[PDB]
């Protein structure tokens, strides 16, 4: 095994466990120690302000099995430090026949047991578990776990009747999964279910959803909510709040509703931010977030979704929430979407960024598998004095449209998404910050055009306004990643909406992924303009390429060149013309990011491990 | 619920959780402090001369489940103390995917792991588990502890290749169980192995048999060999130790084979008690002891037996041993007998009486089931100038036959078994002590005659020696447990040569069962005699009645009388006339015994719980 990064590279599936640790390994954001990671699980602010954060992890694997929340804190979600106990960084693992088939993601009661952070987690135990498979009651099951030492530890209550688990029966027959409970306040659902708690008896200051669905029938969301304020075993099934059909699509800006959802969220916001409002805040809108699964071809057939909605209440005191819109959380292989409150009105979206390996050919040689996404503000982005020229403004795809009095212009309103301020104010101040002059890409703009100051390292961040004509057929973006042999093109193509991701050239590496990401971004056209910009940002990290566009879409993916100057930025054209200019302003350069785990050796491998051949026996977990 | 044992017992399942506690309960013997226990387990003599005594418990509950190693101590097998730590009396419990479903039985490696005492344990995970099961490769695997505190606490080895489970592939397909591993060194097994070691590879000084069967095909024990001295990670499979049929019988008086092993070990014996000779020793035998099921129509499908056997070396390196004749260990409702080494040549045997409320229909009101034996010192008996007139001699069921040089006397060999002195001495030295004068049973013997001494409570021994005419046709014994209206009849009738315990009048609440028990008992007669002598001792330890006849036959059975009066105890006597007179001498009782638990209150109940809806999902145990 040659790790000369000058040639080509060698047969890489010869050298040994984790001997590529750092070679494509993000530097500047959440990821494990070592191993296997996937879900963020367990986030809450504590009470010193600090951010905790949870995190599925199978330790000196890089496959599934065993899982466990893996725990970190953080006082600005940027720079952040590993709990260390007598499970490592482990803080909660199987350990008992309701859980020992894996601890599965869970969220935090912030005043819960005996005043303590508690968590309510899918127990897992023996038994045919999946969304094809013929699953059976018992298998995902609800537990409580609370912690007196801010998480460095989690005391589960005792098996048994009134004990954990405290969720076990399935509110309906034949269910595709039942799991990744969802705990949150809402004076609107308070005020909105306040008529009808003599039906229910539901009284309590909590609500759960849990993620699911039904065989045959599509994706499903129930509702719970605590039985009384102050107790923490009894949760009351009210319904179905979500329900979709199989494999039903909104349409092309929205993905696909799959068979079954996964760990599903439910918020307010306003532009602000967080809204806490019982309705009476008419900028606020009702979100859901959530996974779906088996409604698409690639992805790992995983879609990351959310859905503005309209709460009904229903005769039995339950709550129909009525899509109203449907977008898009992350268009590339990102997935495990969790939210969270955070002070000053904020609610904090983060997901899991898989690899780009799906047949496991150099996972070994990493000695990892996964990351976090970048912490993300969630608010209600809000355009004013939209053209009702804009092209399919009125399908209200991933948006909604409000029209002014005299109908010459319109209101648009959806999901905004934007990396949380402190990183970003970290990130610059840690960085060498090159501003950059604007450019015009005309008829002498090269197909590629290298920054004037160019990246040291795998570590960058990059933004710019595209300004483009209201009919171009031009297309502009950013190279990245870049030598002569080794590049990744982010394209935007306003003719046809879509944003591309281009990896054929990403790396000599073949066992990696190539294949083109895509997204959807609707330019809303402002009335009096001539021209229609994107603001394209991009992060860098190791092998993450993380693009955020009009603090809006988002897409999350992997390249990993293996040559070492494959380091490189820049602008990228196609059919600019004297007449179909791209103009390009505002552009930065960040080289260098956070160091996000200062107290981190640069190889934190503690070498793989294998379960020997009992795992094919148990047959819940690959084993290594 | 009332508790007047003056008067009738009215509807007792009325009674609370743990409201008969104390009613029937043993006092003088081996119990848990509460709860679910049966088999005996991690039997060893530590350090400081103390012994170890482990069972498989579920406390808090009276149904088998989340079995575990309940755990105490004492100096001299009588007296004993709970260990508590912080799972109570509990010392190791499912913990791991690979023992979840229980910690099954296990045995005792002195210096393993470190040097420390080490455990080799059946571990238990999910699937259908039962000889009448379709039972799976890994379901029952073989994993070790070690304890650096002499039994306060276990250590298991981690989860993976080349670690725990350390024995998981099935030596032979299909079996109907795969369980209770006995480790043994063995002068004997490793002189006739040495010639063959090239052939295995295998030469460490520990042995290890796993009871189980084939399914269709009868009983198997196989046989292990530690691979290196030292090292105790890698155990190899010789072969076949013990191969039986399907419910096949050695006939009338070895009970039958059943379908699958349970618990069963290995041992070598002298006249003195256990032999460590390699084979030199002329007056040594080879013993396997061992539970079969399925092969009796009563006593919980259970016999628990032994066998005399000849070993064979097999050209592949393994030990065939040859059934020579075949016995049983107890006739009664007891099961599960383990045997462990002693200081002074000595191997000890002890086992699990169950209850007989087989349809759980006081249990609860109980708070408990089960209790041990005493325990036993086996031995080889030896009895000789037996006359060649005794009839059946020459069957050599349970026994074997040596004749002298001109023919006219046999030397009978068989397994000897009687209650350890320590506990002999210490109940003799704390009881009253009644001698009763000798009494010849004639025409003038009442069918039932009280002793001059009674009984003060339900806690007493007594002792005869039961003298009888060569062609006799009366029938004697003691009657236990005894008022006008209760009373448990101990029969020998040397015609049939059955020994009997009628129960039709032992209580008066009829839940409990009432089956008359029956062992066989060969009265050796003696060269020049002209009568048959029967030593019969009898120990009532609260519901507990245990007997011994010569030290040989054992048959431990339960009654429960409500009246508090139903103490007493006396001769019984049945066709006896001028002509046919039963002598009996050497009559002793013992009223009181010893306080086997002096550190535990009366009542070590803690209440009972129950699992809830989820132990009939799992499927696993009764969950109460
Ligand atoms: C199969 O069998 C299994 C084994 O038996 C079984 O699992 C066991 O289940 C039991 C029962 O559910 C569990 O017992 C509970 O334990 C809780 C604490 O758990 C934490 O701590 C224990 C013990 O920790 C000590 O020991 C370890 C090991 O040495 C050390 O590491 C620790 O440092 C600590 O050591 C100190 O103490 C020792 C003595 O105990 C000393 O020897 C030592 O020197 C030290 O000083 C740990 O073992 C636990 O670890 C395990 O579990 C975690 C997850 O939780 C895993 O991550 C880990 O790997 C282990 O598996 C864990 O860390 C107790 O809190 C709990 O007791 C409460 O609940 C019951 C009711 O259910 C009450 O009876 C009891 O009174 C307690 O309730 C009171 O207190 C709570 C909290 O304060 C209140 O909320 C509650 O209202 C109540 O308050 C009352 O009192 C107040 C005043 O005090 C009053 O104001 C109130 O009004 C009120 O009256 C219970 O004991 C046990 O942990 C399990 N063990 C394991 C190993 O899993 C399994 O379930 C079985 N399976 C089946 C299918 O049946
Ligand atoms: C799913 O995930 C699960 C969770 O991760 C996972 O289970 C875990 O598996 C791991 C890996 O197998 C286990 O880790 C082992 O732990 C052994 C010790 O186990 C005992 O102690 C721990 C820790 O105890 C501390 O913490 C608890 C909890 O707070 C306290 O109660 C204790 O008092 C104690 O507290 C002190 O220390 C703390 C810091 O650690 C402090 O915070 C604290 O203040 C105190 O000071 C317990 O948790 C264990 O309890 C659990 O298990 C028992 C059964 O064992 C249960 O009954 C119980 O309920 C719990 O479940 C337990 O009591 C370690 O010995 C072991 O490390 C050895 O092995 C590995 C190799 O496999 C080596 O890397 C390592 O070096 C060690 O080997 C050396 O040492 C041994 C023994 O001395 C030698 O034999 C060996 O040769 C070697 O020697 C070397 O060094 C010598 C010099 O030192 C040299 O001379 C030699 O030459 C040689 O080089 C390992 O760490 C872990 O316990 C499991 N945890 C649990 C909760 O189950 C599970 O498997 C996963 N499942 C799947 C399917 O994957
Ligand atoms: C004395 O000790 C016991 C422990 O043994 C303590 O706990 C009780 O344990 C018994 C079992 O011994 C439990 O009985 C079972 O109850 C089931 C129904 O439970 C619900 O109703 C009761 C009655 O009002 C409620 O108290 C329960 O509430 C508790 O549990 C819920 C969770 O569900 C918690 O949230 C609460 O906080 C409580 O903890 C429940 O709401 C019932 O299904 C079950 O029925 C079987 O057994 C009976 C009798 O044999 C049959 O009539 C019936 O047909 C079922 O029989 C089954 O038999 C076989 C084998 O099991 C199966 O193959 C068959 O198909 C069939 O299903 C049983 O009655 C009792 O619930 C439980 N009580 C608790 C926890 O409070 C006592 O507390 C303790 N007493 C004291 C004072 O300490
Ligand atoms: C680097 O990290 C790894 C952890 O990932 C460490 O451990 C190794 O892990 C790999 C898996 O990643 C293990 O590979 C598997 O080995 C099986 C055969 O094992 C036996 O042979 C090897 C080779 O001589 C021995 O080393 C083993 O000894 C160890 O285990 C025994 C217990 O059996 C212990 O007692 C010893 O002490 C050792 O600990 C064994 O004797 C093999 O069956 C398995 O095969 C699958 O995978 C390969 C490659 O993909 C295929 O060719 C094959 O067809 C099998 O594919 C399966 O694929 C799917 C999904 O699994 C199934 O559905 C199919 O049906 C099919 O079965 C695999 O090769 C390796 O044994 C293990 N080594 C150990 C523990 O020593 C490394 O140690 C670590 N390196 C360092 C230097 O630290
Ligand atoms: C019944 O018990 C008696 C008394 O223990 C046994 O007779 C004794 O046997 C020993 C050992 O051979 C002798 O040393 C004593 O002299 C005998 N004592 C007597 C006759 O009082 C007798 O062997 C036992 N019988 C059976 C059939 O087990
Ligand atoms: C980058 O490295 C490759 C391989 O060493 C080399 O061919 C190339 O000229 C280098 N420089 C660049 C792309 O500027
Ligand atoms: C990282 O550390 C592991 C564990 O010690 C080691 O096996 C591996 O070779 C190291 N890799 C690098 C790139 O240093
Ligand atoms: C309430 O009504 C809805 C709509 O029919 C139904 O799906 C849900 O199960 C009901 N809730 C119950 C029965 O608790
Ligand atoms: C909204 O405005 C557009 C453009 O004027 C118009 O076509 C449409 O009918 C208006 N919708 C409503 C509800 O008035
Ligand atoms: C660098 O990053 C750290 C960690 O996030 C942050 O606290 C610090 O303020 C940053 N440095 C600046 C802004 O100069
Ligand atoms: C075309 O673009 C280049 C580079 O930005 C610039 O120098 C030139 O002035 C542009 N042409 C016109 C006509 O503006
Ligand atoms: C024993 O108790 C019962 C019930 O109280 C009574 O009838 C009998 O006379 C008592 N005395 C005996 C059997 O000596
Ligand atoms: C024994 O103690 C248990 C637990 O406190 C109690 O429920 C039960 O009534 C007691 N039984 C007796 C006979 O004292
Ligand atoms: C050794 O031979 C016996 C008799 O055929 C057989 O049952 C056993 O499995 C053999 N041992 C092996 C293959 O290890
Ligand atoms: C043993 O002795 C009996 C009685 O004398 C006799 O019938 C039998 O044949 C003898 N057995 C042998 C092997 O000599
Ligand atoms: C009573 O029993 C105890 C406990 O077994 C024992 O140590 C003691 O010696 C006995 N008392 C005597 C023989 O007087
Ligand atoms: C018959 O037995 C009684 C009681 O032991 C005794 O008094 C009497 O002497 C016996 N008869 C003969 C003839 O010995
Ligand atoms: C003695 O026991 C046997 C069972 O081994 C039985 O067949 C026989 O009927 C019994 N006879 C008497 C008289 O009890
Ligand atoms: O690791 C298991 C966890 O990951 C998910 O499948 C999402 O990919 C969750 O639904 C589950 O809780
Ligand atoms: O409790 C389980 C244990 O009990 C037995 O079944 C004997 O009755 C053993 O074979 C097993 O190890």
Redesign the interface.
């Known amino acids: 095994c040659s790790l000369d990064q000058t040639v080509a590279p060698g047969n890489l599936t010869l050298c040994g466990n984790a001997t590529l640790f750092t070679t494509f390994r993000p530097k500047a954001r959440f990821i494990a120690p070592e191993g296997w990671m996937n879900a963020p699980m367990g986030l809450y602010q504590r009470a010193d302000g600090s951010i905790h954060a949870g995190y599925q992890s199978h330790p000196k694997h890089i496959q599934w099995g065993?899982i466990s929340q893996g725990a970190a804190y953080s006082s600005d979600f940027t720079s952040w430090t590993d709990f260390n106990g007598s499970e490592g960084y482990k803080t909660i693992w199987?350990?008992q026949?309701?859980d020992?088939?894996g601890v599965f993601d869970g969220s935090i009661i912030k005043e819960g047991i005996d005043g303590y952070p508690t968590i309510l987690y899918t127990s897992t135990?023996?038994g045919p578990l999946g969304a094809t498979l013929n699953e059976?009651?018992?298998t995902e099951?609800q537990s409580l776990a609370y912690t007196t030492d801010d998480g460095a530890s989690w005391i589960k209550l005792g098996?048994?009747?009134?004990?954990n688990?405290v969720i076990?029966?399935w509110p309906e027959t034949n269910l595709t999964g039942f799991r990744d409970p969802y705990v949150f306040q809402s004076p609107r659902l308070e005020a909105l279910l306040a008529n009808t708690t003599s039906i229910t008896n539901a009284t309590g200051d909590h609500f759960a959803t849990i993620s699911g669905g039904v065989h045959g029938d599509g994706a499903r969301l129930f509702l719970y909510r605590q039985h009384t304020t102050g107790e923490f075993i009894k949760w009351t099934y009210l319904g179905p709040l979500v329900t979709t059909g199989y494999k039903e699509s909104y349409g092309e800006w929205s993905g696909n509703y799959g068979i079954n959802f996964e760990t599903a969220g439910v918020t307010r916001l306003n532009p602000a931010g967080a809204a806490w409002d019982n309705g009476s805040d008419t900028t606020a809108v009702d979100f859901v977030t959530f996974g779906t699964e088996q409604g698409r071809a690639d992805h790992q057939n995983h879609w990351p979704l959310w859905a503005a909605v309209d709460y009904e209440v229903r005769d039995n005191g339950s709550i129909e929430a009525v899509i109203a819109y449907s977008g898009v959380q992350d268009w590339g292989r990102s997935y495990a979407y969790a939210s969270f409150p955070v002070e000053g009105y904020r609610q904090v979206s983060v997901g899991w960024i898989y690899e780009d390996d799906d047949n496991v050919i150099l996972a070994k040689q990493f000695g990892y598998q996964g990351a976090f996404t970048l912490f993300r503000d969630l608010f209600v982005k809000v355009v004013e004095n939209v053209s009702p020229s804009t092209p399919g403004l009125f399908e209200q795809a991933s948006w909604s449209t409000k029209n002014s009095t005299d109908g010459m212009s319109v209101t648009v309103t959806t999901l905004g998404q934007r990396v949380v301020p402190e990183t970003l104010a970290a990130y610059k101040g840690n960085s060498t910050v090159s501003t950059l002059a604007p450019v015009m890409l005309n008829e002498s703009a090269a197909a590629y055009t290298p920054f004037s100051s160019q990246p040291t390292d795998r570590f960058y961040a990059l933004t710019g306004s595209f300004e483009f004509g209201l009919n171009t057929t031009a297309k502009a973006g950013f190279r990245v990643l870049a030598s002569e042999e080794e590049y990744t093109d982010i394209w935007f193509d306003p003719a046809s909406e879509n944003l591309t991701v281009v990896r054929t050239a990403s790396s000599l590496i073949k066992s990696f992924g190539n294949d083109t990401e895509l997204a959807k971004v609707k330019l809303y056209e402002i009335v009096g303009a001539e021209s229609k910009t994107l603001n394209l940002t991009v992060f860098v990290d190791g092998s993450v390429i993380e693009i955020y566009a009009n603090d809006e879409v988002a897409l999350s993916t992997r390249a990993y060149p293996w040559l070492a100057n494959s380091t490189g930025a820049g602008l990228l054209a196609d059919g600019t013309t004297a007449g179909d200019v791209v103009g390009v302003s505002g552009l930065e350069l960040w080289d260098g990011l956070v160091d996000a785990w200062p107290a981190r050796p640069a190889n934190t491998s503690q070498g793989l491990?294998?379960?020997?051949?009992?795992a094919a026996?148990?047959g819940?977990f690959a084993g290594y």
Chains 1, 2 share one sequence.
């Open positions: 065993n199987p350990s026949i309701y020992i088939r135990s023996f059976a009651e018992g099951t098996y048994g009747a009134g004990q688990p076990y029966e491990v294998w379960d020997g051949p009992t026996m148990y819940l």
